[PDB]
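#dry-run=false #mode=assembly
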Amino acid sequence: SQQVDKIKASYPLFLDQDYKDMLAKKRDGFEEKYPQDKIDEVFQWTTTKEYQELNFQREALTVNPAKACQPLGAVLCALGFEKTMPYVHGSQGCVAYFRSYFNRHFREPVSCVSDSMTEDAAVFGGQQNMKDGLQNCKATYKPDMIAVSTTCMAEVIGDDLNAFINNSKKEGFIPDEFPVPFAHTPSFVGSHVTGWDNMFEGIARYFTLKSMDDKVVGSNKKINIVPGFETYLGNFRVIKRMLSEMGVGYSLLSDPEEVLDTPADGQFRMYAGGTTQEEMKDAPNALNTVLLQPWHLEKTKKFVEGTWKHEVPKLNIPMGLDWTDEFLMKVSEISGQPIPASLTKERGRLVDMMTDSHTWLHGKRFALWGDPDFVMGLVKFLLELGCEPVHILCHNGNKRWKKAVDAILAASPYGKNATVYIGKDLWHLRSLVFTDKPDFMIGNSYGKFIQRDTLHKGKEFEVPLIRIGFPIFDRHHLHRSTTLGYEGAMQILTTLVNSILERLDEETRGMQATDYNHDLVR
Amino acid sequence: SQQVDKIKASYPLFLDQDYKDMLAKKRDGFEEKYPQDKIDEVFQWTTTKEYQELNFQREALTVNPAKACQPLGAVLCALGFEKTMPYVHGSQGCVAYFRSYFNRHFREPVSCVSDSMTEDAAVFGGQQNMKDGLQNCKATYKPDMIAVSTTCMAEVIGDDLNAFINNSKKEGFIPDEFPVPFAHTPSFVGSHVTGWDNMFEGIARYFTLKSMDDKVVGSNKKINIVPGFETYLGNFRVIKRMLSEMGVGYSLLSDPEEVLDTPADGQFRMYAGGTTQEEMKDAPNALNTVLLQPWHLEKTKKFVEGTWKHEVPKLNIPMGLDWTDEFLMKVSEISGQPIPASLTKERGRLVDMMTDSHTWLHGKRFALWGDPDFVMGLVKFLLELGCEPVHILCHNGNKRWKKAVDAILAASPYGKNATVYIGKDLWHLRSLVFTDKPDFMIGNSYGKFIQRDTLHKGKEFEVPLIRIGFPIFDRHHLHRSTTLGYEGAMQILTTLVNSILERLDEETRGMQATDYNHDLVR
Amino acid sequence: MSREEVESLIQEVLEVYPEKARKDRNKHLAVNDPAVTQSKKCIISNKKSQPGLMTIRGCAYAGSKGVVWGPIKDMIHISHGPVGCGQYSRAGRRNYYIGTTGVNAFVTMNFTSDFQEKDIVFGGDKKLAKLIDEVETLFPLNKGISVQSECPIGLIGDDIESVSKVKGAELSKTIVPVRCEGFRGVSQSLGHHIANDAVRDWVLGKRDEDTTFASTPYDVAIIGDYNIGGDAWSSRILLEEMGLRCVAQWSGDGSISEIELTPKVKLNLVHCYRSMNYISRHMEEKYGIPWMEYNFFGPTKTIESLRAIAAKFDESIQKKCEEVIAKYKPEWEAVVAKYRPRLEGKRVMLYIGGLRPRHVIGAYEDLGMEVVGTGYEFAHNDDYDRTMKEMGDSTLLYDDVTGYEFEEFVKRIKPDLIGSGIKEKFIFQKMGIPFREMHSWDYSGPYHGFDGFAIFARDMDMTLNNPCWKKLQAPWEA
Amino acid sequence: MSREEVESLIQEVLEVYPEKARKDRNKHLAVNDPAVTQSKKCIISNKKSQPGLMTIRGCAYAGSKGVVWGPIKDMIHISHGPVGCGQYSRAGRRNYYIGTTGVNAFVTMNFTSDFQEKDIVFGGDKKLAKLIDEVETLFPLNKGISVQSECPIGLIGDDIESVSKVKGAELSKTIVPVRCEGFRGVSQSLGHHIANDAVRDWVLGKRDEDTTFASTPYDVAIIGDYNIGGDAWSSRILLEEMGLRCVAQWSGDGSISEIELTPKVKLNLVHCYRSMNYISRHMEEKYGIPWMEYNFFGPTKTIESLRAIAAKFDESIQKKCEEVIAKYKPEWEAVVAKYRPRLEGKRVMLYIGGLRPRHVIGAYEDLGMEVVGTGYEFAHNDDYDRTMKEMGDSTLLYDDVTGYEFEEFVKRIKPDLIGSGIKEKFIFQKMGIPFREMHSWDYSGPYHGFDGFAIFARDMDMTLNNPCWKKLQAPWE
Ligand code: ICS
Ligand code: CLF
Ligand code: CLF
Ligand SMILES: [Fe+3]
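#status=ok
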């Protein structure tokens, strides 16, 4: 039943007595459910250290992974170029999923096409699919560029992207001069960040490999910036802003910031902003190329160093105080521009916030996960704050990255109780936060389920989730935040300290029980 | 007892069994406490409508007010001028309290001096205190200006600020040319915003009243901006940024943004930034003066219109979509500068966020309080979002402001269930949120206590607090936020929608009870 | 618009396509004629999507794992293959359930074999067996395992049926291999068919020789309701208030036990014909269980469906049906009285997967709202046959509409409201047109039954009449 | 720094003042000589603040309402006057208590008469009576009312004593008028004295003719502990583990009933001498209750205080004291072993109100830390007498220090840590010097007793050795 003045959605409509009785009847009559005591016993067992030992012995089963597949990152990279259509050669279900994923994270339209490879192409290949798809996409959506990636079906079949695109141009399906960069993005290798790397390397190669004769390093007085797989629009914006304050000429290659933040003004813009083809063609003429996320831009680094002859600096992700300082100093050295007073004042204000919040931040234990560069920057910043990143999970991390993070942890007294896990999923992390409980979790929306599980053990065992990373589905407009630079450091610090204070307020809100510590001033 | 590896602060140290037993012994033996059943009965009574009727019949008693006294606002206004020392003629306890209040809200040094008026001055007055204090302050802290306000003691005994300062200059305690603007700020009239208005009018009078002969309106191509009592640094920053994007010459009079956000770089800066004396002297030459918070800038408006001959536009606080649009259009009309494409895109992005979050924001009921202009801007924005501001409290509001807010509410279907209260404190609001429960509260840190009270009635009766306003003591760095303009509207929208989503996640986190609605995607 | 105007609009939109794409897409767009009963004379459906045209269709894995098998709560579903397919489909569909997640319920979890390069090169059958052993170790309370194949499984020659047979015999566990590789078929529809076949071959006949279940003459099974936001619970409360006993729910909040008990029911009540007509026909042909389609969208369709269902039983069920209708009449009448004046005359364009584009029309009309355009991602011609009589005359019908086509149709028709998926929501919101997610109910609901109708009316009003839609034009641009 | 260097620093700092201010401030700065017992020979205190020098001192209202009367939980305290004084002091002090706020406890609430212009012009006695009636209506479980006067009350000629008497007789309620107007005195110290006098005249003698309370030979009262972060509870658990019965706590987590029962105790244990020595002397002279000062800051002072207190009782109390000391020895020894190596040799400067500048020195020394400068906002010369022997030789002593003076002293001395209030915290944090709030314990604590020592050591280590202090210099500067 519903009262028209106060209509109930599913929660709390299904908490009504009639719905409770009907659900109980269903369960008792037809579900053959295990007894509640057995369910409680099994849950308690899953919270134990023996279950953790069994869980970490997994070799074939993956439960709740913390990574996606390559073509997602390829699509995100392709979206960063001017009037460019992402085109995934393969089956259409992949493109539907990619678009839904990005739509839910960004709350924006995400344009991407498929050539709809089916059982017919499973034997003969998708050459005809490629020809028809390129022609149809160019005719219908009118892009200036079509950036081609692949699904797992095309990779397993062994479709030659280069030959297929060349045949499409040779038979007149698309004009010869039309730019169609391509990249093989096998979903069974790496993760979404690997797809971003492969797509960017393919685009850069397409635009620069055959015209290196007239290129002179440093002849345009600019610095190339490659952001990598990035889902915070504030990060693109802060990098561009910081480079503009220094008066440093720059080219942000793969800039999807405009197309992912189009205004609602009565018209739909399929394309907006992005790196131009002229910018990519002129990229070898830059002074140098800076990779914002070097740990998943290794193929891009190899191409840039071997072909453009750019001496790519060994820089960490500009996250937190020290690494933002190093990024700014390296940019100053490359460009010859001094670091302005505005950036010095911004750094000082970040340090002031650190000194203001250090008492609440000190000693706090964290479990965190995400992409390798983001996770490493978060660990570095947490160490700078006096926090303890006790659990550091990176499902798509490798051994060299783990060694680098271990070196970072060993350099700080606050990394003593920290452990880095690679190839582990969020079920491993659930076991870790049960057996060795941290104060908070930092990660994407999937960690919310872990929080629920911890709350099921008890309020004192609950590990609250702090939503930083990708994807964030259960909150609105967090994709507008910043994690890079001093601005991103201040935002992360504010989020952390206020999460701590919110948790303390919740724990001390009990009248005459714990509210003696419900302080007005914190 | 304490374990050295895990040291407990007061919470949860006093939840240990020995401390619980000792507290119970103290209560049972010596406190003569009322029985717990009587306490529960009285609390339940205080949650009722009969108690609300008794509570709203108050004529003499004020409980938990939502306002401060005038000299606090006078000090905040004085802090907005270059190398200016706030100087409160009266007793020193007032200055200690003002400094502590602002220190806790801003987490920054707050410089303010007193002439330490004692029982000796309670009969003869504080003329000698004024002379010695002006001399000592100028000699010791070396300001370029001393802005003088008053405490209630000096107002009650009737100290003549003008005569005292003139005598100080006549006897050589301070140079004649040294600027000493003054304002009477009686704490028994108005509130802190009235003190801000009085101090600004005093400073503007001091710098412009006797030199109006050579002034020509509009001869410097600038627009004067008077922000009023403002405790969000982001508001100053966003006003300056928006005016800079339009290419509009402006003078922000009383700009305390720099001195309240000094960097931590190894040195203490008592003064930083601020409106210069030349800016104040040249103010009558502006095209016009725009008052950001007109409902507590009435004396300033009277002076600006009657002396500077500026046709001050009738503008609301630039909060939310419609009022930011009106502010920008009026600025464009006054300055002749078109509204640039960047601001149009920013407005469109705010509208896009509104369309993205409207489903979660629609129909939500709010109790809110604060200063009149901030409260009315928040009400306007909530109406634009489809929310219901059911309780609108303004302790320092007047009847004309209440009439204006009622007119705003009548213009929207979402203001049907809204009631505006003036002269009511937070105990009245506690009664209101008990008897007519809203979904959320928007206000300063004091509302946290109300939240605690609601949680004591039950989890289903708890009204969570959303911290927007002044002062915010239990969270860190929220004073850096923005509430004005499109940027402030986006920040407020994000805070509101994510508070709603956090509450929904908390309510649906119960495993096998309510977690059927614990959706990954919201 | 008149019929000629709609035809001209269709031709103008098709003008941009190449000749082959235009020729193919001309067959998937039509002007509705309610008198037509054979929709293949006017529209063609269930065909291959044209390459590179930004289709909204999914894959067979989405239709099998994400739609049919996934909602089954006490079973563990393995996305066999690389990580992407399982990751993108994890908890994206609001098929609600009651259970302890990770202990006895596993709907919102993502189990995957996470194929690497070596699994592609050398196969993943041994990996699948080891994964099944690890699943048994770490989740002892699971009541069954399904293995949903992703694209590489059918291309590398893996034999998941033999692995399922061997491991099920060894562990005495039901292990259901589903060959739902994404490249199979043209959309989620073949995923529905493959999942139905897997249910038939591996689960449904488990209790054929079991007679311990005590059957009653009022035994019904809800087939094809996936409890989106609790829709199946809202339907079930009405059915049980009518005196019926709902033995099974397929498959929202569904357990494997009630699926096995379904062949014992007296009637099958099919909500989604598209996804479960195969298993309904199989049960009719094998166990002799009649099945009937019903619609619980809006009070009118709900009342008609309740009366039709009660007509299949004795007089006591009919009397209880009349009592239920009388009880719920004031509530939905109050909902109509409140919300129809705010929504009367508004025009709606819908584009959903395979059932709802025709099922929600009655609910929209109960609020005085006119559906001027509708279409399906993956419906067959029988769905369009059912759609002709529900749609108004000279209304627009689209099958597997492209993004460009939908945008142009919306530009010309200019509906007051659009109901589609997440991939069109922000496109049409940026155009200044109110949008309602008709898959996930915009994270609201349920919409089935009278309790669902109240929420449906509230949501349509809150989105269509939101102030935000009057603010898209800056006052210096009116 | 040697004595001559400290004197030269004092003179250099004083150079900036005008002649009158310099002459006055020269008497409030000194170089410590531990052999000196009469501190008035070297430093002068409890004087008027110099105008316009940014003093840190508060007012008599802060010393009475904010310090003494406010912590009393079952009483309602009316800030009589305009809204500001009550608003700024609301819940700013962490005097912890147990109760149901708004029902039977009212510490964190702000009750005020909210004086308007008409109240100033025509008086507020009728408003005060109406307010008392409304308080009785809306808060029936309050066990007493105090009326803390703000500045205008003593200037407009209001008679709150007559109103208090009439309303108390009418309602059979204890109504305590406190003439704590801010202009009275020079600091919070006169507020302490006025509040003590109000307690003496209106509350303390309520049960003089009552003999129903069952007294024991081990009855003690805790006087001058305000339960900052639970400090009084940490002291009380130790006292009761020693076999004593803590009848009253003054005034943190304090009720009016235990204040009335205080004249029945056998011993008074005064923590804050500055704020409650008046009432301690009154109780000694009237009821014959001896009072003794004790210090629970740090294990050494805590052990010495426990032994001294137990020496006032029989042998059973002494045996229980030895048992308590033995029980708690491993815990504070582990705390020292963990944190002293991180803090050994660090130099700290303190500036707090009237007790803690000398009381916390032992706790710092237990961690190997050296206090090189100390000073008081409002202490008297007896406090400095007690401070001489606790401070090291050639250390700096400052009374009512100005912001400029403190900044210059910190610039020259360069301590590793500064302990002061909220009005100096951000100044010294921006200078790159770790700062600990020594009033509110930086919203941490308690610091009293053995349990408080662990928190104190952890906090000092976390602030002094925080990484943030090594990052204030940009690497390009
Ligand atoms: S009462 Fe005094 S200023 Fe003795 S007014 Fe002040 S809670 Fe200080 S050094 Mo704040 S004489 Fe208490 C004090 Fe000491 S408020 Fe607290 S810390 S031990
Ligand atoms: S049509 Fe369907 S969703 Fe596509 S793969 Fe095939 S079953 Fe799956 Fe999977 S990991 Fe990523 S998302 Fe693909 S490229 Fe492969
Ligand atoms: S020294 Fe002390 S705090 Fe000052 S007034 Fe006097 S009792 Fe009070 Fe009060 S309302 Fe504001 S803060 Fe004053 S100007 Fe008056
Ligand atoms: Fe959006």
